[PDB]
Design a protein around this nucleic acid. Structure first.
Lengths: 107, 93, 170, 95, 80, 95, 103, 150, 86, 103
DNA sequence: CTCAATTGGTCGTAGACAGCTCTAGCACCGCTTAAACGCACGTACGCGCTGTCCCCCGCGTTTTAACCGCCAAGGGGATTACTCCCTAGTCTCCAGG
DNA sequence: CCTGGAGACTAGGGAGTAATCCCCTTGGCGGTTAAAACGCGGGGGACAGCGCGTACGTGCGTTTAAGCGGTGCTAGAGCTGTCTACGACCAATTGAG
């Protein structure tokens, strides 16, 4: 059996995005097959980028289980994803800050 | 002294523990919810979802107050700086 | 159907006294909105009504009377929200016929003008809210002594921050 | 039962193809699933708002490329267009 | 005790140490509640409205994600 | 419908709504026309968005009271119910 | 010509509100009749709240030309109105917040 | 001269304060309007006095309560005297220094205290407060009509 | 006849204008490095609108920025200028 | 300090009067000819030769007024808590971090 | 399991971008009268030194009430069917942007 | 002048709130050893104030451009009405979530 996912070479569905784009489109939109492949590819790339950035810090602590703390460091650590995603990761905290004003007798 | 409070920061920055209460924290919300409209109901996931956001909001509010003391050559936070920092975002007082 | 002047709300229905062409003032009847054909007369009538409400320059009043002021002909129509509560109208208007002393002054819900002033009573815990202006004429001392410490209002948040900064600048 | 379609195993299907020796839990999946749903609604709204003032009703290929350039800056949207052009080039070529 | 005495003194000190606060004043324990009340009232007034809009009587976790989106503090949780 | 300058006759007709001892200039009308248009667009966008999360489609009279309570704070939300109920009670054949 | 303005007395035209609501159908949708009537009332009230302040701010000059600087006293002068309008006002001029530490 | 701080209208005359440099507020005297010569220090103050008054609405701050100030002063030249305070009110024409008839009652607040009985005089741009006991004895018809406004 | 080839436009910036614009907010005195520090943020603030106006003009199949793309470019940053369309 | 005196004024009079001088007149402090030369330098980066109308500059001049004053007010308010009266160039990066901007 | 994705009917009425009318792009270099910006030498208040009020770190003692396991009444979640009286489609009158 | 709901109509397909699946929330009692409140020694914060550096405030000198629009080349919107090709909604294969 053939489908639209195996023709373009993408793991994201084509019908789901086409059905979801018809709700936000005003009146009766004509969302064909040329408007979903370009939309799902960006979402797949954005989803894979966070996973690839989080996988680089999971092998340093010697742990095979995926922890939610590694996803927050992959977003707040980079200067490109921190300015875009203005939300906060639930159950991750912040990045450790190092300063010279955390001792006795001032600095 | 500064050796005891030095490791306490790293002990909290490496583990995301549940520092917010569950039973006494729900009564504070119920006391205000009962004043608007009576005969209400709540779940268990809503409290956790609110606590997960409050744990980040507290740190976000404390960072803005702690950053206003490095330039002024200070190490102790002051309640007067919170009102001045809240006016820039839009919450004010 | 010429020029509307009278306007009142009767049971949630805003009436419109349409002036008949070629008739006197005694033959004007209330014509409800059910069969009309004037989309411009409705828009042209409210253009001059808002000018009369703002023409009072600090409430002008002379010494020879003949200067009666009023907010509306039906007192904020029927769906009122200030003074009393639980909408509707004045269901309970008893309390001044006994003449007692108030217990204490507590707080209530804040609003943008005309707050719900709750008046307590002795012995029983009956809650009564006044709204009529006739109760402040027979006994004006009780209305004056009632307003003491109802709503706690300190000062503006912007003015308090200026005085607090002078104690740590020098 | 007519519930909403959520992206649960869609991320796992791609994670198992690249790193088969990795295991995810049931708590870190909802955090990644909600992010895609929150980032797609903004793109959908931006694409829908660009057709009411331009007297349009058909979504072409420029409406999808404009949202990436508007949201993502020039330091990250340079490779996205190059990666997306290949999917359109391989689709109109053959089966 | 009363419901307003939920937040203790060490609870705020254990949370302020995550950002980088060295010394904590004594007035913070009495000034944080005044801000927390206003921060929680904005969500309380929205939860009842979201519950009444759907003709329901129970505040679920799905409406909190939609209510926090308009306040500016978006959090990824149960949907949204 | 979808035009940019859909309001032109009603904008110039506003002259007796203020004090008779003053007149509107040419640079003060564009600031007042866009102010109401922005609020109208925001209301139209919120009405078409608050119905999908609660499983709705028909925008009746109950879907408009939620947008006013969510936008305006609680200190001024009760001042609009009296104005909104007057427009509903006056409309006959609808109770 | 009854339409909807003959059954509801309002300043803003009722027929001009549903003209833009018909485009946002959102798949199988429907536009109500009372929705536009309820939405126009809030807009009329918000417009009148500023039109009254613009007339009350001027009472001593009696100028026949409305200045753009006088219109900023209603938004920037009210805390409940400045926080609701998140957009920036087109034009200069702020509030002269004179502090005791500056003098 | 830097700016105008004190401004009182006594005996139908508007006098401005001369802010002298290198001194304070106690070293400033008074001067008639016909003796000054500074047209640039008039419009700038008139445009600010209205802005400072239009923004002081919606339950303002409190003042010194339990004080009658006037209420039967004395005799033998009750004018001249010394100086009251350093604000815009205090030493102002409260009707006792001019002898005018009241016009109407304005002002309607709702704060922690009594009602604001702002009595406005005829041909006067300013107003002051009056007592609640002597208002129903002289002209009680105005106090009754004031409550029946809304 | 199109556009003039202007180069080195960072030297022609008005100096007293930056000092006059700060007097409206309530700034008493200023430093000497303010004129060099403000330009380092002005370009970054203007690039977020310049890069968006060109995209908005190209999306509408046009080449000249009219009086409508500016509103759409300012609405993304939370500005929304008044007096230009709706 | 006078106009016909050999000695100059003291540092504390003209700087204070300039704040009140700009609170009674509505003018545009941003220029038009020198400000238009900086936009064309950035608009001609990696794109083709484009043009502009007479409304984009007027809109940018009004948009920059609501931003420069808003950015200066935060610095002026933050400079008071530092036991000082003059603003510092390093305070802009600290003030931008509280609003949400990177530094 | 269920009820989503899919291929490829078929002439519906969307869209690409030529040509035309007659706006206001922005070159060359006209005039009026106060701004740009060099670097005098007055006297503001930088952020170092170190005076001295009554703050609050570290981690004792042992109250008050954190939050653990596991009772079992009957709240009201989130749907699925019935059949009320909502207001689209789209003809062609004589209003209005 | 322009160019789209208005009104009559009677199709399409949703709100109201009945029925009833199969396990949450909240009042309640009993009781581990978490981290609760109050206020002890003596670390080194904040605030008040003396002394006098660095490099700003505030006019004049000398420009060579600032502002309004002065005049006129040949690019620039939007409108019009041809031809063109994406993918509405339809039925129903055979496999993902």
């Amino acid at each position: 059996a053939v489908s639209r996912s195996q023709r373009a070479g993408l793991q994201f569905p084509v019908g789901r995005i086409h059905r979801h784009l018809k709700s936000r489109t005003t009146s009766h939109g004509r969302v064909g097959a040329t408007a979903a492949v370009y939309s799902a590819a960006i979402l797949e790339y954005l989803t894979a980028e966070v996973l690839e950035l989080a996988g680089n810090a999971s092998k340093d602590l010697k742990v095979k289980r995926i922890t939610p703390r590694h996803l927050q460091l992959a977003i707040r650590g980079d200067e490109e994803l921190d300015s875009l995603i203005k939300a906060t990761i639930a159950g991750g905290g912040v990045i450790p800050h190092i300063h010279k004003s955390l001792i006795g007798k001032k600095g | 002294p500064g050796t005891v409070a030095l490791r306490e920061i790293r002990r909290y920055q490496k583990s995301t523990e549940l520092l917010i209460r569950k039973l006494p924290f729900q009564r504070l919300v119920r006391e205000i919810a009962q004043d608007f409209k009576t005969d209400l109901r709540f779940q268990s996931s809503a409290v956790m979802a609110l606590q997960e956001a409050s744990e980040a909001y507290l740190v976000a509010l404390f960072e803005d107050t702690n950053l206003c003391a490095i330039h002024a050559k200070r190490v102790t936070i002051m309640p007067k700086d919170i009102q001045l920092a809240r006016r820039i975002r839009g919450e004010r007082a | 159907v010429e020029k509307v002047l009278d306007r009142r709300v009767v049971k949630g229905q805003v009436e419109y006294l349409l002036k008949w062409k070629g008739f006197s003032e005694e033959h004007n009847t209330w014509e409800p909105e059910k069969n009309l054909d004037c989309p411009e007369l409705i828009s042209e009538f409210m253009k001059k009504y808002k000018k009369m409400k703002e023409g009072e320059n600090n409430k002008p009043r002379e010494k020879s009377e003949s200067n009666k002021r009023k907010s509306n002909f039906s007192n904020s129509a029927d769906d009122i929200k200030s003074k009393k509560k639980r909408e509707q109208s004045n269901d309970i208007a008893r309390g001044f016929e006994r003449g007692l002393e108030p217990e204490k002054i507590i707080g209530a819900t804040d609003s943008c003008g005309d707050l719900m002033f709750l008046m307590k009573w002795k012995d029983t815990d009956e809650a009564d809210l006044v709204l009529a202006k006739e109760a402040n004429v027979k006994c004006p001392q009780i209305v004056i002594a009632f307003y003491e410490e109802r709503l706690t209002w300190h000062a503006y948040p912007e003015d308090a921050e200026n005085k607090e900064k002078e104690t740590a600048k020098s | 039962k007519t519930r909403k379609e959520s992206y649960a195993i869609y991320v796992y299907k791609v994670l198992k193809q690249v790193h088969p020796d990795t295991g995810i839990s049931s708590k870190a999946m909802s955090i990644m699933n909600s992010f895609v749903n929150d980032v797609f609604e903004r793109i959908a709204g931006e694409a829908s708002r660009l057709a009411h003032y331009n007297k349009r009703s058909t979504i072409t290929s420029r409406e999808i490329q404009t949202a990436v350039r508007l949201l993502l800056p020039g330091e990250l949207a340079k490779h996205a267009v190059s990666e997306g052009t290949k999917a359109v080039t391989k689709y109109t070529s053959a089966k | 005790r009363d419901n307003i005495q939920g937040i203790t003194k060490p609870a705020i000190r254990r949370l302020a140490r995550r950002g980088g606060v060295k010394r904590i004043s004594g007035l913070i324990y009495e000034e944080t509640r005044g801000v927390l009340k206003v921060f929680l009232e904005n969500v309380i007034r929205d939860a009842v409205t979201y519950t009444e809009h759907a003709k329901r009587k129970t505040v679920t976790a799905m409406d909190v994600v939609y209510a926090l989106k308009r306040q500016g503090r978006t959090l990824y949780g149960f949907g949204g």
